RNA sequence: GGCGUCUGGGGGGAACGCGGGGAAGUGAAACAUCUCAGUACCCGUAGGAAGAGAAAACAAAAUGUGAUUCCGUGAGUAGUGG
RNA sequence: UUUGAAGAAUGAGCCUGCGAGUCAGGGACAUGUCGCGAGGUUAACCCGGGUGGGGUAGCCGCAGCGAAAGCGAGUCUGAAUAGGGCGUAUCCACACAAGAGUGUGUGGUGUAGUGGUGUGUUCUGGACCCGAAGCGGAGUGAUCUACCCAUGGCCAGGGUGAAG
RNA sequence: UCAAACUCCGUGAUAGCUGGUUCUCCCCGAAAUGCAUUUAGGUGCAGCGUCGCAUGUUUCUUGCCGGAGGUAGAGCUACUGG
RNA sequence: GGGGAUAAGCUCCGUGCGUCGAGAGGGAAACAGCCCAGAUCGCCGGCUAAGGCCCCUAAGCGUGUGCUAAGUGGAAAAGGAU
RNA sequence: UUGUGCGCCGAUAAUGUAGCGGGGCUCAAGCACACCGCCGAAGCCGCGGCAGCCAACGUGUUGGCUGGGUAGGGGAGCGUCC
RNA sequence: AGUUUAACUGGGGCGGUUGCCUCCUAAAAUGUAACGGAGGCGCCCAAAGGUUCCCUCAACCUGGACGGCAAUCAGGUGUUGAGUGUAAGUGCACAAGGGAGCUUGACUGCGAGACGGACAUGUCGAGCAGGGACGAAAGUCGGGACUAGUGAUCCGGCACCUCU
C-alpha cells in the first residue's frame, strides 16, 4: 500500500499513543521516534507496532 | 457530441471581512486571502492559510510600507 | 392513546437545566488519523442545537 | 368377525371462551428483515360463562410478601429495532 | 387551473331535495379564562334512583452536573485556583480587580406551578370528501365455449370405377 | 369480460396523481429564490406573510469622512500571446 | 452577459430596476407585462398627468417663420440618381 | 465638390381595400422650431357618510395619517336546528 | 413466488455527467446558472516537517582540452524574465527559491474572539499549563507558501480506564 497507516507505542509503558503513515518501501524497518507519553508525563521513545 | 468541461469548485468567500475604520475585538478576522496580498502590520497576525487576524483590540487601518500593502490596528482610546 | 416518543431522537438529544436542547457533533467516529487534534478537539462535547431545527426536535422528543 | 340386546351420539345458534392453521393490500415515501397481524378467514370444541388457580412464585438480605383472575398506575419508561 | 383563458383548455341542460376539517384519548405544543397556590390533583373503586360525598396508589412542580460510580449550589473535563461546558428565576445597592468586551464578592428583592375548560396546529386511528389498474382468504360456475367419455340420430340426387 | 373468470370478505385497500370543499364584513398580505434530496410537477430547512411578547429608530433616505477592489475605458520596449 | 447564426414571443444568469402575477381607471383602434396613475362610499362641482383638440370624438379646418409633391406623412436594406 | 432638412427608386403573395382605426387632408387635417388656450382618469381639490392605527384630553368626543388585493394570518358578525 | 432495475436531459433514447481544487463567464465587496470556456485530484515526503545560520537566480557577452548552442571553469552585464513535490490562481528576490548543523511541535489538556453558513459539516485562532526541539538571546515550532489528495450515522474489531 506504499503508505500504510502505522501506530506508535511508548517504549516504557507500551501504550499505543499516536498514529501516522510512512513509506514502507522507503523505510522498511521500524520507526524510532521520540514523542510525549501522556501517562508517563515525559518524552519517551516511541516504537511502531 | 458532448462537453468535457463543466466542473467547478465551491466559492471560498475570501475578501476583506473588516474594512478600514471599524472597531475590532481581539482575534477578529480582518482579511480572508490566499496569498499575501495584504501583509500584517502592527497588532495584526497571520494565520495558517495567510488569513489575517487581530491580536489587540482597536480600529483597523490599511497602510503601505516599502511598496507592500499592509494592515494595521490603531489602539483606539479608552473613554 | 398516548403519544409515542421518537426512539431515534430520544437517543441523540438531551434537555439541560434551563430547557436547552443539546447534541453531539459528527465526524468523530472513524477515519480520524488524518484529522488533526485541532479538528477533533473542536468536534467533542455537547452543543446547543441550532434554532433552525429546534422546532422539529421539540416535537419529536415531547411526542 | 357374526349375531341378539340396553344406553348414547349426528344437526342448529347473534355475541363472549379455549386450542390449532394463518395471508395481502398497506407503512417503511422503493423493498426482501420488520410492520399491517397472530388481524381477516378456516378448523375442533364446550359453557352460562370459559380459560387460570393452591408455588419446583416473586423478592433482595427487609426476621419481606403468600392460589388465580379482572380493573388503575408503574409506562409509552427500562428496553428492543435494516 | 395557469406566466396567461370570454376563450376554440376542463365542468355544469333546468329546478328542488342530499353531498365534504368530525370524534376518542388525564395524549403533545401554544394561547385565553377560572380554582387553589409552594403546592395542584386524583385513577381504579365504594356509598347516594342524579350532576353529590369519599378514594394518596400515582403524575407535575419543588437542584443541578456527570456515560456511570458519585458529588451537590455546584458539577464534568482536566495534573491544574486553568481555562472552558451546564446550572445557581430575575433585578437593586455597595465594595474589589479589569477596562480582552466586564467579572467576583457581600448584602437586599425574593422565585410559580398545577388542575379543569374555550381555540389553533399535531399524534394514532378510514381522519376534509370522491376515484383506480390490480393484491390476498373463502366459495360459485363447462346449460355459452375447448377437449373427452356412454348411448342414439342424420347425410336428396348424379358421376368416376381400386383391390379381388 | 380473460397476459390469470365471477361473488362476498380484508375494505372506507393505497395513490409524490385529477376533481370537489357551502354565509358576511373589517385589517394586514406574500412566493415562483438558495441548499439538499431514488430528486426535479414532491418534500425539509432557510428566504418573503400574519398574530402575540420583548427592545425601541437601532431600519430607511441625504450630506460629509475612512476604506478595499479591478469591471468600463485605455496601454503595451510594462508581462503572456496575436 | 453567456449558448444560438451576436435569430427567435428562445434558453440560462445579475439589478433597494418596473409592471403583470396579486391591479381597477385614462392612453396605445382592439391588445396581462408599454406610458399616466394605486379604486373607503356618494355628488348632474373644479384643476391636471400620459394622450389629444377637421367629422366619427371630448377640446384649435390656433398664431409666426419655414420645408415636402412623394398621400412622404400612413413599413425596410446594399446601392442608383442633374 | 463639402456638410446638412425633407423627398424618389430599390419594393415584392395567396378570402376583400387591408403597412393612417374610418372618412378624408397638401385651401395640411404632414414635418421642424417658439407661443397661446382647452379636453382628459376611480389621480389632486370641494361638500357629506363609514372604518382601522395613533394622539389630545375626557367619563367618548375631536384631530392627524391610513383603508386595491389571490395564496394566507388575525378580529368581529348574519342565518338555521336541538 | 415476492420484488429491484437512478437522476440531469432544449420530449425520451443512445452519447456525456454525478464529490473535491484553481481559473474566465461573474457586470472593480461576498455570491450568482447553462449538456458554457479550460485544467487537476482520490496522492507524495521521516525529510520535500521544526529551528539556527549563510547565499541569489534564468538569460546574454567575452575566453577556455576534449566540449559542440548547451556539461565544468573565470570575468562582466543581469531586480526577478529562473525556481517553488503536484493543476491554476494569489504569493514569494526582505525570499515562501538554493545550501548546511541539530532534531521530531507530523505533541498532551485547553482555547478568549471570529470567518462561513438552512442544518449537518468546514476554517483561522492570540494565549495558558505540562513536557520538549533549535537558538547566546529575543523568540519560533500543535506538519508542508496557500487552496484539492476524501465518506456522516448505524454495526463491529483492537489497546487503555479509579465506570457499571
Curated annotation (Swiss-Prot), chain A:
GO molecular function: structural constituent of ribosome
Top-level taxon: Bacteria
Keyword terms, alphabetized: Ribonucleoprotein, Ribosomal protein
GO aspect biological process, one term: translation
Any coiled-coil regions, as ranges: none
Keyword Ribonucleoprotein recorded: yes
Cellular component, GO annotation: cytoplasm; ribonucleoprotein complex; ribosome
InterPro entries (UniProt xref): Ribosomal_bL33, Ribosomal_bL33_CS, Ribosomal_bL33_sf, Ribosomal_zn-bd
Entry's family note: Belongs to the bacterial ribosomal protein bL33 family.
HAMAP family per UniProt: Ribosomal_bL33
Protein name (database record): Large ribosomal subunit protein bL33A
Organism of origin: Mycolicibacterium smegmatis (strain ATCC 700084 / mc(2)155)
UniProt lineage: Bacteria, Bacillati, Actinomycetota, Actinomycetes, Mycobacteriales
UniProtKB/Swiss-Prot annotation, chain B:
GO biological process, one term: translation
Database matches in Pfam families: Ribosomal_L27 (PF01016)
Domain of life according to the entry: Bacteria
One MF term in the entry's GO annotations: structural constituent of ribosome
InterPro entries assigned: Ribosomal_bL27 (IPR001684), Ribosomal_bL27_CS (IPR018261)
Keyword entries, A-Z: Ribonucleoprotein, Ribosomal protein
Keyword flag Manganese: no
Protein family per UniProt: Belongs to the bacterial ribosomal protein bL27 family.
Name of this protein: Large ribosomal subunit protein bL27
From Swiss-Prot, chain C:
SUPFAM superfamilies: L35p-like
Region spans: Disordered: 1-63
GO cellular component: a single term: cytosolic large ribosomal subunit
Record flagged with keyword Heme: no
This protein's UniProt keywords: Ribonucleoprotein, Ribosomal protein
Keyword flag Glycosyltransferase: no
Biological process, per Gene Ontology: translation
Sample GO molecular function, one term: structural constituent of ribosome
Basic residues compositional bias, start-end: 1-41
Biased composition (Polar residues): 47-57
Database matches in InterPro entries: Ribosomal_bL35, Ribosomal_bL35-like, Ribosomal_bL35_CS, Ribosomal_bL35_sf
PANTHER family recorded: 54S RIBOSOMAL PROTEIN BL35M, LARGE RIBOSOMAL SUBUNIT PROTEIN BL35M
UniProt family annotation: Belongs to the bacterial ribosomal protein bL35 family.
Protein name, per record: Large ribosomal subunit protein bL35
Organism whose genome encodes this protein: Mycolicibacterium smegmatis (strain ATCC 700084 / mc(2)155) (Mycobacterium smegmatis)
Lineage: Bacteria, Bacillati, Actinomycetota, Actinomycetes, Mycobacteriales
